[PDB]
Every structure is written in C-alpha cells, then in structure tokens.
Amino acid sequence: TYPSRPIELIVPYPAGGGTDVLGRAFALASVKHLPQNLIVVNKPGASGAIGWADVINGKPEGYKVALLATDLMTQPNMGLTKITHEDFIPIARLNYDPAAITVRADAPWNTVEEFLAAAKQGDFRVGNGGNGSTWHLAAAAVEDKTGVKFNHIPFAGAAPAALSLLGGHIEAITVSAAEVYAYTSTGKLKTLAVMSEQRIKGFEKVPTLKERNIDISIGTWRGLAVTKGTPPEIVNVLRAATAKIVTEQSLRDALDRQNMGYAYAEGEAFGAVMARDHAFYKGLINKL
C-alpha cells in the first residue's frame, strides 16, 4: 500500500529560507496524515530545474514530490529549459502572494483608475525587484492591459523598491502585497489594487484588478506535484493527505511567520492555474 517507504520532498531552495521553512513545516504537519515520513531535500540551482529534473527523471512511484514555484512559468517561456508544468501532475497549491499597485500614502491618487489616468500622461517610475522577475512582469502586465507606459525601475529585490517609494524617489511599486503590508497597515504606503482572483487578508478594502475590469492575476506561489505518469491511486493518496495537512494550525503558523499567504488550491485547480499562467507568461515574455 502506498506509501510504504519515506517520501522525499524536493525543495529547490537552500536550507533556512522561507520555502525551506514551508517545506519542513508541511513535512511536520504530515505526520498524522501519512504513514511514512516526508523528508526534505534542498536542491536549488537553475531556478528550480535541477530539482525538477530529479523528480521528472525519478520513478513514477510517489516517493519524490516537487515543491513547485513560480519559476516553472517563466524559465521555459524564456527558452531556458524544456521542462514545463505538463511534466508534472499537481497535488495542490499551498501559497500565493499576489502583486499589487502601491503608492506613497500622500500620493494624489486615491483609486487605481485615478493612478492610471495620471500615468497615461507621463512616464511614471514603477519599482520592481529585478528585470524579468515577477514584479517587473506584473507592471508589464498592467501596461499590456491598460495601454499605459511605465519607466520600469529594477532594484536588488522588493525591499529596496519599497524603501525608494517611501522616500519619494519613484511613483509606484508592483511588488507583493505581502511586502508592503507593514507600510500600508501603518499609513506610510497605500495600495490601490491587488492582482489576485479575490480580495486578500489584510487588504479586504482594496479591489482586485479583475473586479475593476483589468484582467490580471500575478504573484509568486508554491505548490506540490509528482512526475507525469504517476498512478492515479498514488496521486489521490497525496491529494487526500494534503487536503488534511493544510488544515493543520502548525502549517498555517509557519506560513504566517514567513509572511507567505495561505492559498490552498486542489490539484486539478492548481493544474488549471498553471496552464493559464503558462500561456499568460508566454505572451507577455514574447511581447517584451
């Protein structure tokens, strides 16, 4: 009966970081719900592709689980790997941290519509965490749907971009809502829209872009998958266990400590989101 020996959780991040913490918290929370241990392996490199290859090239027996992340959407579409979401069977999404449009609290704009009408008259500087990464692509996605043209300002990560905005050196940032909450909750920045499917915790008074008729959902995420070809009975054991594991308070606490949003999605739903996002990133990366 599956599982009959330990299961490796292949985490393509170094030990000690947020995703390692998430992976090990998931493993700890799995003790009541799987009769074999989940063992974390840290295999970073090539934006996840060394870890993906370990799972894909492994046997379809259920004893390797990939901790999938956003890079799976961008790397193949940048022509940097042949690996795609279709090499996997999804178990579940765990985490999603949507991008947001955030300005300084004293900005003249009080709605995303006012911000866009102003931006269309100029070359607003929009900070991100690096060229070609999620928050840059988030700003580019806004350009694509609204016709505005920004001056993209990459920094060495999201935190320096937020500090720049706080100092009045740029007009907006499109980094994660999670990264600006410390400032929006304390009146230093204000968020005009979240690029999510639904309103999120801590930002319940802020509209999504989608509800304002701007069709964009983008952000970083973490989920679980096994290699294509894994028997359905095995996939179902993992999906059923994961549905239990995500209700564990210890796992939710770990996500909170790492400032990572909880966003459980069932396997098939996670698969559908990845297919949609793959096509979205393909189109946007090609345009850029």
Q: Which of 211, 178, 179 is nearest to 193 (CA)?
A: 211
* Cα gap 214→156, rounded to integer Å: 28
Q: Which residues contact 112 (CB under 8 A, 6 or more apart)?
A: 101, 192, 193, 207, 209, 212, 214
* Cα gap 18→11, rounded to integer Å: 11
* Cα gap 274→277, rounded to integer Å: 5
Residue 239 contacts Cl ion per CB under 5 A: yes
Of residues 31 and 240, the one with the C-beta less far from Cl ion:
240
Give me the least distance between CB of 14 and Cl ion, in Å please.
Answer: 9
For Cl ion, which residue of 69, 178, 265, 284 counts as binding (CB under 5 A)? 178
Phi and psi, residue 96, nearest 5°: -150, 125
Of residues 67 and 107, the one with the C-beta less far from Cl ion:
67
Give me the least distance between CB of 235 and Cl ion, in Å please.
Answer: 9
CA dist list (Å): 196 to 30, 100, 172, 216: 28, 8, 18, 7
For Cl ion, which residue of 128, 176, 184, 227 counts as binding (CB under 5 A)? 176
Of residues 77 and 102, the one with the C-beta less far from Cl ion:
102
Give me the least distance between CB of 271 and Cl ion, in Å please.
Answer: 10
* Cα gap 282→78, rounded to integer Å: 8
Contacts to Cl ion from residues 251-270, by CB under 5 A: 266-267
Q: Which stretch binds Cl ion (CB under 5 A): 10-18, 36-44, 104-112, 223-231?
A: 10-18
Q: Which residues contact 37 (CB under 8 A, 6 or more apart)?
A: 6, 7, 27, 31
Q: Which stretch binds Cl ion (CB under 5 A): 51-59, 140-148, 167-175, 238-246?
A: 238-246
Q: Which stretch binds Cl ion (CB under 5 A): 61-69, 71-79, 128-136, 234-242?
A: 234-242
**If binding means CB under 5 A, how many residues of this protein chain bind Cl ion?**
11
Contacts to Cl ion from residues 76-105, by CB under 5 A: 97-98
Q: Would you give the DSSP letter of residue 260?
A: -
What is the rounded (10 degree) CA torsion for 263, 258, 86, 31?
A: -80
* Cα gap 48→53, rounded to integer Å: 9
Question: Tokens 């008259």 map to which residue?
Answer: 121
Of residues 217 and 227, the one with the C-beta less far from Cl ion:
217
Of residues 118 and 163, the one with the C-beta less far from Cl ion:
163
Give me the least distance between CB of 162 and Cl ion, in Å please.
Answer: 12
Of residues 123 and 211, the one with the C-beta less far from Cl ion:
211
Contacts to Cl ion from residues 13-72, by CB under 5 A: 17-19
Residues forming the site for Cl ion (CB under 5 A): 17-19, 97-98, 176-178, 239, 266-267
